[model samples]
Target: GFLKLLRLLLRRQRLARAMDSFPGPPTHWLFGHALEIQKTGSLDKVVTWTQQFPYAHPLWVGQFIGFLNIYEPDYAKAVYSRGDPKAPDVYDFFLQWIGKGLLVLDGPKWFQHRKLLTPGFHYDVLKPYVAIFADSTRIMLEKWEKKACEGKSFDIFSDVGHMALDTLMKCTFGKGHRDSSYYVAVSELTLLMQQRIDSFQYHNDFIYWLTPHGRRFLRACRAAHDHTDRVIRQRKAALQDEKEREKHLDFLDILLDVRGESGVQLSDTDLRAEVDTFMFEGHDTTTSGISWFLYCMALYPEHQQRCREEVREILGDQDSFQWEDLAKMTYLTMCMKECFRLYPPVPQVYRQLSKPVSFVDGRSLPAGSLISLHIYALHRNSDVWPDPEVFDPLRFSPENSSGRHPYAFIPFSAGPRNCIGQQFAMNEMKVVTALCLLRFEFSVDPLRLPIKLPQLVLRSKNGIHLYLKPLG
Candidate 1:
């Protein structure tokens, strides 16, 4: 027993030695850096660590699993440029909910899935979605009109969350489910996932499943899957009609049509996995991006007014947003980019090095080491982003951005594994924000700044509170 214990201890020592070159904040003997991260705030703490350690730092989770948290552009380019697999320690948690979809799949399977699904997000396919985006956004705006008339501030987070889900339902499945149950189920999965990740004790399969939250998590997954299954079945049957199949295509239509090299169409199980994956990834991330951009607009009146004027000019007499109008609103696009840099929707992405990698500074990591690409910290790197906290949309202007590092402002990440639906997300953000600005003037209370909660997506602890004044 003593010999086995000694061997295990020695192995950890060797693993620790491999990362000796990178320094980090002190850790508790048991808790590691987790408690400090929790207390200092997840977003602020990591950036603080980045400042202290420079390019990268060794972040220990419970004295066993450690990650090299890298933020520098050079460091990010060195690792992310290569197609590395997602680290299992974290990504495995998504396995149950999303299944083996693009977000989770690696190696040959990922390539196959990516290639098969690429057409689903094609510009031709995405153009029609602009109308769908407008319809869903209009539905939300109608509800907000009621709230804005009251002239009191309320949290816009849930409203945006609901609208994002509605948009996904229409775009992904070609219909809308405005009911509370489906929306709540999808939202619960995200909340529960964050909880499970934070609660290290619950990381164990047996322990997690035994707990109430775990049961609830499974319940939500079932509800989401149940909805997806029904829709996929209905769509598959409808696609049988030659006349009906010739109509407008949606994401489901694309998936149902995909054929493998062996001439086998996707099985029901495969279809559900992909549909579930899109539903999860497509909604929450967009919700975070759109909500934060709106918050940024509320904070800066002058920029908001400029964007409003541009959108107004672009629309002229037209009410509904058209695909052509998305390209015309240049100023609004810049503000959205700036907002992404400030508040990256997916703040941190994890990977396991498939091969050893050497950094610009000569420090290196062995193959299989865990990595946390801290986009939140990378975007705010003072060396790259001068006065990083200042909300300056002009930085994205062609002349100003020409000299910037390509990896500096990666909101949808970079390289082979970048977000598949970036175009779709951006188009929806443009339409929703443009419409919202046109309908109501968003203003924030000076005293009620959102306390950042970095979860599956960046959310505010107190919700995104803002006062909406209806425009004439």
Candidate 2:
């Protein structure tokens, strides 16, 4: 009751007004700019709105209740760097699939597990996976080879989608998906879960579960869960050798083991949760990043040509790339950073203020305030990134980047709760980009541009198309 009363004050005459002082459409005492978002879907609508408000704005939910949308770099840095709690209610749906895993868990448990998982993404551990990423990219390229010869356009997003899952399967277990069924099931599960999130009416668990949609969601979860359980059992049997364990560390191996000296292991349920969490989180996001990189390459051939040239120099005679080679692709590194700015796969990140937080502009949000870091809009803020709409790789060059804020470009997010697998993810993307560039030349229809929508990840309302002209 005491907290509720404080919210009433903040929501009514005091703190709310201060928040509203940041630019936004006139807030309705009842519904706020939510009515505006309804008229224009939040993803596309937010883009148009940024043209008016340069950096940040208050998106009123009702009367004085709303989220603070941060578009500028400093604003993003302020929110993300604080190490705030993940908004539990906002991620309630994902908990159904991921359980108490790193993605959903908060407080000390999150911190602890995040620490445990960090080593798996370390350079020494990830160095071996270059071969796996290359193998997966080669597998996909071989299929595209036939399509390229036919002079056809393919849904490059869909293929990369499969390739990512397959690559993840290999990386996690030392084996790729032997059967494609697991891949398909997880794909369907993600699609359904996101559909439920977007459906306002399905917010009610009782009502949603009673509907056909929710029943299907339950079944999808079951299939994915069943597969994860089986994989865990298989991994346990594989680890019986014990000596086989210490050879290296990946996500599965770590979760399956304890401190070699102390004998502390992840709980069975948590282990399974981590597996599903890693599978879902790792693959899809990488695929989106890879697909968008290809789309960018297709859009700007000069940049793509330059990248191939760089890749050729570093990869001289390497049939498969190594971690050392990744660092040498200086020009490609610029394009990768710029690609992330242009189209971050996870377009929006959420945080709820645990304590009253103030912005540099002197505006503040009370403890209960919610924050939406609009990564998509942040990338396009002309004030932060001049000619933000254009594809300019030089924006990430050391000379150009030295003057920019550290928080300005957050492809893998930033600060304490940032992506743990970022190093692994970047290396994976580099291998794919290098191997694919070495084998083929990619192009898109000059006319049919992709309509990007930020869903579970950034995806096209239609599809991202590419024409692969095999150079190999």
Candidate 3:
């Protein structure tokens, strides 16, 4: 134990020296910034630190582990534009659940997986998803109309989550039966992953698997994997019949059809990994974006009214939305971007340096140093966005956006390693939010404000409660 401690101490000293150029908040001897960050709130506290530190700061989790947290636009562009791998410290935890899919992949394998999946997200394929989203949103809004009549505030997060999962099921697995068990499993896995990150001892694979929570995590993983595996098995069986193979395709169809350069298709493990990754990445993140955007709409009634007017004008004399209408709701799109800027779905992303990187300001870091890009903090940088706390949709108008830095507002991240399903996500959000605005007017109670919780996706601690007034 003493020998192990000695090695860690030496390693910590080396890292501290390497990151010495950057400054950060005071850290504890044992807990480092981890304890303080939890007590102070991770989202707000990091933004506060960003203001104090200027561009970047080293955040030590414990005596031995550290990461340079960056929130500046230039700093973000410098590192994220490269094809560096995700930080193993956080992403490796996802391996048991998601496997070696695109989200956790790097290097040549990542490139191959990305190429194989690109066609799945193409606009031609995605055009059909807008209708799926509208259908799912219609169901959710029907339920909301029932709740609105009760004359009380309701938590909209879970409702939005259900709708997102429903839409994903239609888009991915191809308009099938709804399975709450799979939804429950996915939700549990997300929670368990966050819990494992907080509980230090659970970081050890053997120790974690032996604990009750770890066992619970494994059970959830089994349930999630079982669902995907069964679907793939059933689909593969269907594909064997030549007549069944020529039908309209879903995401799984695209995956099964893909072939590598040498004519080898994806192995069973690879196929399952990609499917699981998409299901895991797709729903919860979209849920967060939609839920929070609605909350923003509730808070800013003027913007809400304007967006509603725009949506109403576009959908004049028609009950359902067409794919062509999504682009014409110019005002609503701005509002969505503003909501994304305020409450990024994935609040933070991490990376490990593949090679030495030098910032535009001449500051540099050697290879292997961990870098945390705090999207929440970066979005609120005063240098890039003046009056950052205020909601202003005009900031996204074509004229205003012309002068802005590309990295200034990256809710979907920027560069080659950005979220693959971003366009799909945007289309879904627009469809659902527009349908919602058409059916109900959302307003929030001042006292029942949501408490922000940064999970794998940005979630609310108390949940987002809003009063809904049905608009006839």
Candidate 4:
């Protein structure tokens, strides 16, 4: 095994030297950038590198593999337009969690499944979801009211994580399936996945599986899978009922009914895979997004006040906000976009070339090359956004944004493989934000900036602390 690794190391060194024309900070002889990533718990330093280096630069993540980090909008446009396959180097561990579902699949399977599941998130289907999102938000906000009355600074991220988890359970599996154990399991699973990715010594599956972290990872995965499997079994039985079948289908229903090119319905295993996939992507990412949305509101109270005014003006004295009300709160949408820009739910996506590709910047790599498209840095590009660090929602206003590049704002990514739940995610955000703004005013902790970290989604290393006061 050691000899095999040494040979692999030699091959990687050759590739590293071949790609030396592209520049970055010096790679460690044995470790590459694994130590740096584990230390920071994120790829944030590479984002820092964008401060001094060109958008197209080389990276050695390990002995045998190399990465080209692309941060410029034009470079991103060129790569994403080609529909290159996902970087397996980065997504293989993900496949362990999600299996062969849409997020990790490539080529025909991804295309076919993407088409088959499109209706699950369509406007007609998602409009009904607004009510479900509201129910969960109301439950969460009611709890927050108690905290508000106490005038305590609290972890909004923790609350929103649970709310989003509950919302995903309701929306995807339909109502009456809320277990707090599944919530804790998913959170632990995310931490385990992050740990696996950050540490180089754990790269080998055999060694990792023998260790405590790997055993815990397996346990967490089992707990989550069992939760999904339980709901799926109940829903499968429920769908068989004649009267209950008349009710609208949820995500599980959509998958069960879908037939592919071969005219075959998905097998039970595949159905469970999609259910698990959506549970992670839909729930976890939305938690990251809503957490940041509220943090941004706290970070900039003037914008929060204005967004509050806008929501109040739009809904005026209405007890419930419908899906229809979302579009009218355009300014608030701008603020959400700004929030996403600064803190995207999925911060980075990578591609391992399906075929040789070149950017207009004159940098080209072989078909097997690993490319890191850092959405976090792309959003912060000084060239695209002026004074990029400042929280300015007006950057998205009609007059200000009319001429921006099509790919300049990609909180949901671009082209064919972008997030399918973007509209669903946005509407949920609008509904939750509008209600919260009308119910309370927020203020951030003045002592420190959040210790922001990137995971499967963006998260604060130290929790985001904020005080909320109930509105009269």
lDDT of 3 by residue, 20-107 (tens): 9998899888778878666526788888888899889998776667889999989999999997999887888888898999999989
RMSD of each: 2.5, 3.2, 2.2, 2.3
**lDDT of the structure predicted as candidate 1:** 0.84
Which stretches of model 3 miss by more than 4 angstroms?
A: 1-10, 240-249, 258-264
What TM-score fits each model? 0.94, 0.90, 0.95, 0.94
Question: Pick by TM-score: which candidate is best?
Answer: 3
Task: Give the better candidate number (1 or 2) by TM-score.
Answer: 1
Assess the local accuracy of residue 108 in candidate 1 as a C-alpha lDDT between 0 and 100.
88
Residue 388 miss distance in model 4 (angstroms):
1.3
List where candidate 4 sits over 4 angstroms from the true fold: 1-18, 41-44, 242-248, 258-262, 447-449
Provide the lowest-lDDT 10-residue window in model 1: 258-267
RMSD of 3: 2.2
Off by over 4 Å in 2: 1-18, 26-42, 60-65, 176-179, 241-247, 258-264
lDDT, each prediction: 0.84, 0.78, 0.86, 0.80
Taking the tens digit of each residue's C-alpha lDDT, what string does model 1 give over 1-472? 6996686566557558878998888978986777766663777878877778889998876776678899999999999999999988788888778788889888987887788777778888889889988998899999999998887888898899888988887787756453457678867887788766656666677778889999999999888888778777777666566534365345777777733232437767777888889988888898889889989999999999999999999999986878988998899999999999998899988999889999999999888788989999999997788898899999999889989888888999899999999999999999999999999899996677788887688888888889898888
As for TM-score, the candidate ahead, 1 or 3, is 3
Model 2, residue 244: displacement in angstroms? 4.1
lDDT by residue for model 2 (191-239), tens? 7766654455565666888998888878878778877887788777766
